[PDB]
């Protein structure tokens, strides 16, 4: 079970014990909608409880909702089931999802029913990523974004951006502010999932599921476990940290009928990847993408890191030539790279003809591969074809 969950209760009291079918304890709560903790992740009575649970319909899709499944900008969806929020055969993915984008799709691309996650220093622009990538998916498959206790700027980059796009129209928004509530918050990506599983599950679609910051997440969870003495901490954050985390994201996957597809985002506090949100992240979903911050300071958009990011199913999606170039892509890239701190000290002149080439080569990537235009959606064949051309320019094979 997730060892939190979403209840519903009406006048529901702090400390107060309800019987699901376990028992838990109430440790949060806004209104009827309650957070319940379960008993093995507590140091320390009755009334019963109903999990917390939402309409589902395909009427979501267009509209834009708070973190409790409530309608902000659009009309009420009609309701065609109820859905518990707390979720619940499996396929390995072997499908490639294109980003349109060429520092994902060739080296690292993402897979139908993976997850994997982007983490971006502060400051980066994490936020345009995610729906650059949410306008070019939402051409071809249904999007749901999970937006977590986000900022009022960002907040309205996400409503402007996604109506003004149309993009909106195969999508569907779920968003808290950040000086919403904690539960709020924590609600956001449970109510985004479960619109996610009933479209994926039992409407047989392939969704993509783009759900940030999971910093923001994590800190609602440390702010209601604050004042809660009984509730143990491991590495500045609640204990049941890392099992909360793996229930959100196992919720989403291959099987016979649909996919979801999830990227969870978030920001590494000190750019420290050794954190305990990406450090747990990480370990959980099938690779990440890092953002750069060095890529950022010479003005690339998108900053991805090509040597840092990694994607554990690719390999299992792709082409015989596409795993060629990705092969020479990264190997270049990264002979290049040397090339490039070796000149820091000798300078050009110092190198063999054979650094200048992937040195030449590391430059073009970033200038003419890495860098694409928010609005430019590269196709595969594109992709490979400015590899090609690289590869021409700096005289390697
Ligand atoms: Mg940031």
């Given at each position: 079970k997730p060892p939190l969950i979403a209840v519903e209760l009406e006048n529901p009291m702090l400390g107060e014990v309800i019987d699901l079918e376990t028992k838990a304890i109430v440790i949060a709560a806004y209104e009827n909608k309650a957070l319940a903790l379960l008993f093995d992740y507590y140091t320390g009575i009755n009334r019963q409880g109903n999990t917390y649970k939402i309409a589902v319909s395909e009427d979501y899709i267009g509209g834009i909702f708070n973190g409790f499944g409530?309608?902000?900008?659009g009309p009420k969806p009609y309701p065609e089931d109820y859905r518990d929020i707390n979720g619940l055969a499996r396929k390995v993915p072997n499908e490639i999802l294109y980003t349109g984008i060429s520092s994902i799709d060739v080296a690292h691309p993402l897979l139908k029913g993976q997850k994997i996650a982007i983490f971006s220093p502060p400051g980066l622009p994490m936020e345009r990523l995610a729906l650059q990538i949410a306008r070019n998916v939402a051409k071809d498959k249904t999007i749901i974004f999970a937006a977590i206790g986000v900022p009022s700027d960002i907040y309205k980059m996400f409503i402007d951006e996604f109506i003004n796009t149309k993009a909106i129209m195969n999508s569907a928004i779920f968003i808290s502010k950040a000086d919403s509530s904690p539960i709020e918050k924590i609600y956001t990506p449970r109510v985004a999932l479960t619109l996610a599983e009933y479209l994926a599950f039992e409407k047989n679609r392939d969704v993509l599921v783009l759900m940030l910051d999971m910093t923001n997440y994590a800190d609602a969870l440390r702010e209601i476990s604050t004042l809660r003495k009984e509730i143990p901490s491991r590495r500045g954050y609640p204990a049941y940290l890392y099992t909360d985390l793996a229930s959100i994201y196992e919720r989403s996957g291959l099987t016979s009928k649909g996919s979801i597809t999830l990227i969870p985002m978030l920001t590494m506090p000190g750019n420290d990847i050794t954190h305990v949100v990406p450090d747990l992240t990480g370990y959980i979903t099938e690779g990440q993408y890092v953002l750069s911050q060095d890529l950022h300071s010479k003005?690339?958009?998108?900053?991805?890191d090509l040597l840092k990011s990694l994607s554990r199913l690719a390999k299992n999606g792709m082409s015989k030539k596409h795993k060629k170039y990705a092969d020479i892509l990264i190997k270049s890239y990264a002979k290049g790279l040397e090339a490039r701190d070796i000149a820091t000290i000798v300078g050009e002149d110092s190198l063999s003809k054979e650094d200048k080439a992937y040195l030449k080569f590391a430059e073009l990537v970033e200038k003419e591969?890495?860098?694409?235009?928010?609005?430019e959606y590269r196709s595969i064949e594109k992709s490979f074809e400015i590899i090609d051309s690289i590869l021409s320019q700096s005289g390697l094979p």
């Open positions: 409530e309608p902000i900008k003005n690339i958009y998108p900053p991805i591969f890495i860098k694409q235009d928010y609005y």
